[PDB]
Design an enzyme around this catalytic site. Structure first.
Site: not given
Ligand code: IXM
Lengths: 147, 276
Positions: B9, B26, B115
């Site tokens: 991503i 993450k 945020d």
């Molecule tokens: O699927 C996700 N689980 C998360 C958990 C914590 C923080 C972000 C995400 C997250 C994200 N999925 C995305 C798909 C397209 C563009 C941006 C994100 C994203 N975040 O930008």
């Protein structure tokens, strides 16, 4: 008073780590005051973190984390400083703090393992002390009574 | 390390799979990004709600922390790009509702997000919205002297914080929620895209009105107060939010109050006539 509460905590650690009879309640305090002091290196913190509330919070972690069977003062410093690091992370005025003064152990891996262990056990209490003022009063009272 | 990685991503989010469920990782280097990530873990372990991203697990290997989260198909920013120059009024309503529901939940558990912005809001293919990225979040409730003014992305930052306020309540996320509401209801463009702190305050005040000492007594005591020229309050927000009804606009004005004390809370906003 911050002064009194830190001594109550240093007293508590002596009453907890019975294997460290050469321990004076002043020493733990010195370890805590030293990391606070050098963080005043202009861009780590513009103000002291150690306040009555934050000692109370620190004591909360320590009471549930420091083993009675702690072998050495270096091992105690290590866990004490881990708890302090989580206190800064969670309760600190600033949005973040560095690792440097908190890490005294040679094995970095162990430090982070401890951070995760303490979090997995204390996470509910870390929030509850903040959300539930009766619980904050109870912990403050206990710390006071450690004297 | 039993998570099959896929498309890439304070950190970096990757789509991944285990053997079966898809997830987002993450990954966070351990060599104050860590203090920030530890806080996020602590808070999320205690905030379980359908409108808040779920943390499933926390892994520690080869000098990295991997937080394993549920996967959502997109963030609100990319959502804005996929449809173009238009969300149906019902979708606007639905997204604001869910946002306020997850935000109301945080506030009721004594957590400030600090945020709120479209990149931190996640949207599923099913139209479920979730709050994410609690790296800047914190617990509140113990009497403190202050927090930090280094919070909230510029375009979503309320005037009191722009004026340097170090102390604030849940009203901080309520200004941010209002700014998102205007994005939803126009065409997904920021309401106040300033260049810097000064220019941000100019944009807010040109549209809403420079606040008087009558409306906001304690403002002159804020550490970075400056007296801006006294611009017209153009309370007809109609020109900025033309696809919002009279009812929607009322709620929008109540979110967008300069004085933090005049801001409606998440609980009150959900009882708003707009919704029904
Ligand atoms: O699927 C996700 N689980 C998360 C958990 C914590 C923080 C972000 C995400 C997250 C994200 N999925 C995305 C798909 C397209 C563009 C941006 C994100 C994203 N975040 O930008």
């Amino acid at each position: 008073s911050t002064s009194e509460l830190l001594r109550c905590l240093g007293e508590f650690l002596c009453r907890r780590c019975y294997r460290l009879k050469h321990l004076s309640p002043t020493d733990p305090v010195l370890w805590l005051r030293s990391v606070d002091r050098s963080l005043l290196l202009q861009g780590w913190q513009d103000q002291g973190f150690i306040t009555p509330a934050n000692v109370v919070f620190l004591y909360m972690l320590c009471r549930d984390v420091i083993s009675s069977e702690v072998g050495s003062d270096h091992e105690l410093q290590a866990v004490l400083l881990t708890c302090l690091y989580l206190s800064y992370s969670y309760m600190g005025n600033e949005i973040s703090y560095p690792l440097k003064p908190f890490l005294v152990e040679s094995c970095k891996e162990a430090f982070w393992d401890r951070c995760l262990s303490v979090i997995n056990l204390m996470s509910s209490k870390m929030l509850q002390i903040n959300a539930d003022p009766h619980y904050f009063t109870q912990v403050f009272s206990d710390l006071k009574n450690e004297s | 390390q039993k998570y099959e990685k896929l498309e890439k991503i304070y950190g970096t989010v990757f789509k991944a799979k285990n053997r079966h469920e898809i997830v987002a990782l993450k990954r966070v280097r351990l060599d104050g990004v860590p203090s920030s990530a530890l806080r996020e873990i602590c808070l999320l372990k205690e905030l379980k709600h359908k409108n808040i991203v779920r943390l499933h697990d926390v892994l520690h290997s080869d000098k990295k922390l991997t937080l394993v989260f549920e996967f959502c198909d997109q963030d609100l920013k990319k959502y804005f790009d996929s449809c173009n120059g238009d969300l149906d009024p019902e979708i606007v309503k639905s997204f604001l509702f869910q946002l306020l529901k997850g935000l109301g939940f945080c506030h009721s558990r004594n957590v400030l997000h600090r945020d709120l912005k479209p990149q931190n809001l996640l949207i599923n293919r099913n139209g479920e919205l979730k709050l994410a990225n609690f790296g800047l979040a914190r617990a509140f409730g113990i009497p403190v002297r202050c927090y930090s003014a280094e919070v909230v992305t510029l375009w979503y930052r309320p005037p009191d914080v722009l004026f340097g306020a170090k102390l604030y309540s849940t009203s901080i996320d309520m200004w941010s929620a209002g700014c998102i509401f205007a994005e939803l209801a126009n065409a997904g463009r920021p309401l106040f895209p300033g260049n810097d702190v000064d220019d941000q305050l100019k944009r807010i005040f040109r549209l809403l009105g420079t606040p008087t000492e009558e409306q906001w007594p304690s403002m002159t005591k804020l550490p970075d107060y400056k007296p801006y020229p006294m611009y017209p309050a153009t309370t007809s927000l109609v020109n900025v939010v033309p696809k919002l009804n009279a009812t929607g606009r009322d709620l929008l004005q109540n979110l967008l109050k300069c004085n933090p004390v005049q801001r409606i809370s998440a609980e009150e906003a959900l009882q708003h006539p707009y919704f029904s």
